[PDB]
Each structure stands twice: as structure tokens, then as C-alpha cells.
């Protein structure tokens, strides 16, 4: 699960907490990525608000942060779906999105689902450690088609 601050790329509005979007039940899309490594969008269909519980602060190396519950699975750089911590304590990366507006822009220009690296580029981003914030209220969405969804800081964060 993500902190209530923790902001999710949306198509209609750019950079949303996901707070917001399920404390408001905002009818809104969000991008996704397919198993053949191609963006497209899809509408919110489930609103999580998963009461409260420890949120850690990941601090990554770009100098953006992920405050998640420590199982909240997100994409690495090996393609595989793995716990942020468990990726923080293996010394892994996550793959990320590069260029958030200018891919936003691109994709606006195309019928999706369209390839990833078509409409932008990926980084690799590491994990460089972890605060507790302690108890803090914590929240998740569902999707009908692919489990995962880009995050404002380019990650890529799925059930």
C-alpha cells in the first residue's frame, strides 16, 4: 500500500495523491504497462483506503522518495515484481520511467497501447535506504486489465 501523499501519474490530471483519488473516489486513468513493454491507460475501477499501518520512506537515488508499506511490490531493472524492501535489502534497482512529461506529451499523440521505449527511455534507480515514519494511513487501487501503474516519480508499482 502507498501513503496518502504518494503521487500517481494520471492521464486527466498529471502527478495525483493517491489519497485524493480514493478518499474523493476520483473517476480517473492511469498508465500502465502491458507484458509486451507498452504503455496504455486504463480507468481506475477499485478504491482502496487501507485504514493505517508502518510506512517507510525509501529514499532513491534520483532524490525522489517512495513511502510504501514495505511489502508494496514495485518493477526492478531484472523485470521482475519484487517487495520494496526486499529490493532495497538485495541492493536492487528499480526501472523507471525517464522523462514524465515528455512521454505524457508523446503518448497524448498516439493511439495505445504503444511501446515504452517508442514514446521514452528507462533508468535504473537504486534504493539507498529507509526511514519509519511510523503509523501513517495508507491506501491502494485496483485495475481491470494489468496490475500496475506508473508513479509521478517514474516507478512502476504493482499488486
Known sequence: ??????EILTVEYGPLPIGKIV????????????????????????????GEQE???YELEDGSVIRATSDHRFLTTDY?????????ARQLDLLTLENIKQTEEALDNHRLPFPLLDA?????????GRRSLGVQ???????PQDHNFLLANGAIAAN
Open 55 to 57: 510506512v517507510l520512506e
Open 23 to 50: 478518499s474523493e473516489e476520483i473517476n480517473c486513468s492511469v498508465y500502465s504497462v502491458d507484458p509486451e513493454g507498452r504503455v496504455y491507460t486504463q480507468a481506475i475501477a477499485q478504491w482502496h483506503d487501507r
Open 1 to 6: 500500500c502507498l501513503s496518502f501523499g504518494t
Open 80 to 88: 521482475q515484481l519484487l517487495a520494496i524492501e526486499e529490493i532495497f
Open 137 to 143: 494511513r495508507i491506501f491502494d487501487i485496483g485495475l
Open 120 to 128: 521514452g527511455t528507462i533508468k535504473m534507480v537504486k534504493v539507498i
